[PDB]
Amino acid sequence: CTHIQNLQQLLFASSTTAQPILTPWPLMKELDEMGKINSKLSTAVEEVTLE
Amino acid sequence: YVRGLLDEWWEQPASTVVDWVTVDGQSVAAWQNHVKQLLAFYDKESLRT
DSSP: OHHHHIIIIIHHHHHHTTTTTTTTTTTSTTTHHHHIIIIITHHHHHHHHHO | OGGGHHHHTTTSSTHHHHHTTTHHHHHTTTTHHHHHHTTTTTTHHHHHO
C-alpha cells in the first residue's frame, strides 16, 4: 500500500530525481557541459592541433 | 574579469589562436623584406647588371 502510492509520486521523485538529481542536481552542468566541451567539442580540440 | 571570457573559448575552439600566428608574422613583414630581398632584389640586378 505505502510503496504503490510512493512509487508513483514521492518515491518517483526519489527515483526520477535521484539518479540524475540526488547526487547530480549540481552535476547536470558537470554532465552536459562536460559533454559539451570534452565530448562534443572533443573533436574540436584537435582543431587547434590540426590547423 | 570578463575580458578573458573569449580566451577560454580560445582553448578548445582555438581557430582564432592559430589564426593570428600570421598577423604577427605580418607584423614582421617589414623584416620579411630581407627575405623578399634574397629573391626579389636579386631581380633588381637583372636590369641593373
